[PDB]
């Protein structure tokens, strides 16, 4: 059996040698002459109130106006960000929700958590209420992230070291992804919706192909658990936050890490990572009660969204690119924006 | 402000009214997390507390003196704990069950208790110990075949605490054995915390009928201590 370990070590050495060969120049050296971004400041336009307990997940709509939120009081709320109105209030069967999703078409929302079920809620009914549509029931661990592809396909991640691709109408798994060795904590669908990534509490991230069911690449730069992941708008890169107080940028074709976002004053782990529209800004939420705006090319801190009284747990930037919304454990949800 | 926008504001007001009406139920409900190993005996505690008074979470409803209590036993989850234990912040109290008859896994239980106690998010959350299976511990100590000194050498130089309150007709040796384990847990309980949270020990068997009242009393004590510290009288 030892020859298997020897072969694994040999292939690992070959992979590391290829990575060293392709690393001709660091990203920072190339970006040395780029004009640094100024001090970005945001001024908390709307504060959304009404949740009774902690907030773990938020998701914007495709119209950049509607907004879903998951709280451990057992409520999903659909907000009208422009007006601070409450459109819907959906009570969940299980109070320990850990993720939520808003379908691209607007007709469905998803939720899930310690109860391993992922529940799809029909929003546009001829009866006027919001009903549970399906209850996906094949995960043997808590469900930490779920993201829609269509109105019939959803992709879930579980504490069970596996992701899945369900068929909502049937209610059965269509493909199970079984490469990780830890609890998958986050999930990010690519802009083209044929690939996606996940970080799974083993200091590694993996790129999967939705049709086939296999791990394309594996990225192993981090030191501790990976908590959040998100794609660059291009679709050829993604940033990852972790519990060792660092964010890192991975590119798929280079198959390495390009830049680590860190500071000696930060000894707290990231809980949410999102990009801006142009990819010039990387927003990351921390356990030290506030978020941070990074410059994804110069790796210099360029802002602090210090407005929360507790842990920041979720972070979303609209498709329009106009607003960023932050939810925290203080039962609030703030929508930030700039000023000219 | 258009007419439809006024109607939308009205619907939002009604939604907020229902939300406020649910806030009453939320703040009148106390959430407890039940933790234990496979041999702990948390199942019989649930059975005791429910007839009286691939799913990943079990909820148990019980009511003591018109005070609602919600308890949550974790089910179809893996053995790694450091990620889903954060969801149980801001709960009233954590209930920890230990099998005091199995000396081999006592150190594992102590390490688990230490990890729960020292976690960054569970620093304001008290723990209610349930030193389960005292009958087995008695039967094992009186019928001496397993020495506790083989696993904890400090038992040799140990004495029964002065404030011990033995049950009538109980051997001194079983009292010493049952208080040594409590002392081991309380050593971890007191070494840190800065006074923000405490451990309430209890010796329980599989035939007791007064555990819900114990949890009720301990939650009362937790809230009393919290409000006393807020008012700076303690």
């Amino acid at each position, epitope marked *: 059996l030892d020859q298997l370990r020897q072969e694994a070590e040999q292939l690992k050495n070959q992979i590391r040698d290829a990575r060293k060969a392709c690393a001709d120049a660091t990203l920072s050296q190339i970006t040395n002459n780029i004009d640094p971004v100024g001090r970005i400041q945001m001024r908390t336009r709307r504060t959304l109130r009404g949740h009774l307990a902690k907030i773990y997940a938020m998701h914007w709509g495709t119209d950049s106006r509607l907004l879903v939120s998951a709280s451990q009081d057992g409520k999903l709320i659909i907000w009208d960000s422009y007006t601070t109105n409450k459109v819907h209030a959906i009570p969940l069967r299980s109070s320990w929700v850990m993720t939520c999703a808003y379908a691209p078409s607007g007709n469905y929302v998803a939720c899930g958590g310690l109860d391993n079920i992922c529940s799809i809620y029909n929003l546009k009914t001829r009866e*006027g209420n919001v009903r549970v549509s399906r209850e996906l029931a094949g995960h043997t661990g808590y469900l930490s992230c779920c993201r829609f592809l269509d109105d019939n396909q959803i992709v879930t991640s579980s504490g069970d070291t596996t992701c899945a691709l369900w068929d909502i109408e049937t209610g059965q798994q269509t493909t199970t992804f079984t490469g990780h060795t830890g609890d998958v904590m986050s999930l990010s669908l690519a802009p083209d919706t044929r690939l996606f990534v996940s970080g799974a509490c083993d200091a590694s991230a993996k790129l999967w192909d939705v049709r086939e069911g296999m791990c394309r690449q594996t990225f192993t730069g981090h030191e501790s658990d990976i908590n959040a992941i998100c794609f660059f708008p291009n679709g050829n890169a993604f940033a990852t936050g972790s519990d060792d107080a660092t964010c890192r940028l991975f590119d798929l074709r280079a198959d390495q890490e390009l830049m680590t976002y860190s500071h000696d004053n930060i000894i707290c782990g990231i809980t949410s990572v999102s990009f801006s529209k142009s990819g010039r800004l990387l927003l990351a939420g921390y356990d030290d009660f506030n978020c941070n705006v990074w410059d994804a090319l110069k790796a210099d801190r360029a802002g602090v969204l210090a407005g929360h009284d507790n842990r920041v747990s979720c972070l979303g930037v609209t498709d329009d690119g106009m607003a960023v919304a932050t939810g925290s454990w203080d039962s609030f949800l703030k929508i930030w924006n700039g000023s000219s | 402000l258009s007419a439809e926008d006024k109607a939308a504001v009205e619907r939002s007001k009604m939604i907020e009214k229902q939300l406020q009406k649910d806030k009453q139920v939320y703040r009148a409900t106390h959430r407890l997390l039940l933790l234990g190993a496979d041999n702990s005996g948390k199942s019989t505690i649930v059975k005791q507390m429910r007839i009286y008074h691939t799913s990943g979470i079990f909820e148990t409803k019980f009511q003591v003196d018109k005070v609602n209590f919600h308890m949550f036993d974790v089910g179809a989850q893996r053995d790694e704990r450091r990620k889903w234990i954060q969801c149980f912040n801001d709960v009233t109290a954590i209930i920890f069950v230990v099998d005091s008859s199995d000396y081999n896994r006592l150190q594992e239980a102590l390490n688990d208790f230490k990890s729960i106690w020292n976690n960054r998010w569970l620093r304001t959350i008290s723990v209610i110990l349930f030193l389960n299976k005292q009958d087995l511990l008695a039967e094992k100590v009186l019928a001496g075949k397993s020495k506790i000194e083989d696993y904890f050498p400090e038992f040799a130089r140990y004495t029964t605490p002065e404030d011990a309150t033995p049950e009538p007709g109980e051997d001194p040796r079983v009292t010493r054995a049952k208080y040594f384990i409590r002392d081991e847990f309380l050593r971890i309980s007191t070494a840190s915390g800065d006074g923000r949270h405490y451990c309430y020990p209890h010796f329980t068997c599989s035939v007791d009928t007064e555990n819900a009242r114990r949890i009720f009393n301990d939650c009362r004590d937790i809230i009393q201590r919290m409000h006393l510290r807020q008012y700076e009288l303690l």
Partner: single-chain antibody
Framework: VQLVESGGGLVQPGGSRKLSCSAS????????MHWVRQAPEKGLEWVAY????????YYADTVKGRFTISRDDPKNTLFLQMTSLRSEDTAMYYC??????????????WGQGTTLTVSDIVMTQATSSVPVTPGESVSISCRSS???????????LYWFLQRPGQSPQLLIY???NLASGVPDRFSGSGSGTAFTLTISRLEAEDVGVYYC?????????FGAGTKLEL
């Protein structure tokens, strides 16, 4: 989804009567209900309105004193207490549900209507009658007095269809959106005072009378209706 109205018939002038609207098949409490009446051979006309929670009640000028609207959510019934009837109140009274949030579709279901016999923005549809053959595209125009484009981006125009012997059905809400089950043939557009409804390919089940309604401010005012005869 169903609404049934009862309590019609003859009544001597000056009397009183109560109409009931029994609902079933949807969440009655979350909907605000209306009352639209239609004279024996005239167009539609708004009467009253009660909001969800009964916290907002509006009446028409002609009935602001003698009619009372009220609802009983637990038993899913809508009431209209009529007093001091005159000869202008003879009509068919419709029970219309409406829900208001971001992206909702008000006036989406119309009850079958009850018949009662007693022994402000102006919308005009100058095209009283338009003859049209199947397969050809027809355009119906409606005009307003005040501009219906509010500052929030919405236009607040509604298009309704009434078959020869049925209750009105929603086609277009807010000048561009399409109803739940209405085919994609119907589409509408406008500028803010002038509006047009276009049928791409006329069919047999698309004849009747078409109405244009404003929801910019109360009271709600309809048009005279355009008849499409085959």
């Amino acid at each position: 989804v169903q609404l049934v109205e009862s309590g019609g018939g003859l009544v001597q002038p000056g009397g009183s009567r109560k109409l009931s609207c029994s609902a079933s098949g949807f969440a009655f409490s979350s909907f605000g209900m209306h009352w639209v009446r239609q004279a024996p051979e005239k167009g539609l006309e708004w009467v009253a309105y009660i909001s969800s929670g009964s916290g907002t009640i509006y009446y028409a000028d002609t009935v602001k004193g003698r009619f009372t609207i009220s609802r009983d959510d637990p038993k899913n019934t809508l009431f209209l207490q009529m007093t001091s009837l005159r000869s202008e109140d003879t009509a068919m009274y419709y029970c219309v549900r409406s829900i208001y949030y971001y992206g909702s579709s008000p006036f989406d279901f119309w009850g079958q209507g009850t018949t009662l016999t007693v022994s402000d923005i102006v919308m005009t549809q100058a095209t009283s009658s338009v003859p049209v053959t199947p397969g050809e595209s027809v355009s119906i125009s409606c005009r307003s007095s005040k501009s219906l484009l509010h500052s929030n981006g919405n236009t607040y125009l509604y298009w309704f269809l009434q078959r020869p012997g049925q209750s009105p059905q929603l086609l277009i809400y807010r000048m561009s959106n399409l109803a739940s089950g209405v085919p994609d043939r119907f589409s509408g557009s406008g500028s803010g005072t002038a509006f047009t409804l276009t049928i791409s390919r006329l069919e047999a089940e698309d004849v009747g009378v078409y109405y244009c309604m404003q929801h910019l401010e109360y009271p709600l005012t309809f048009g005279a209706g355009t008849k499409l005869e085959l």
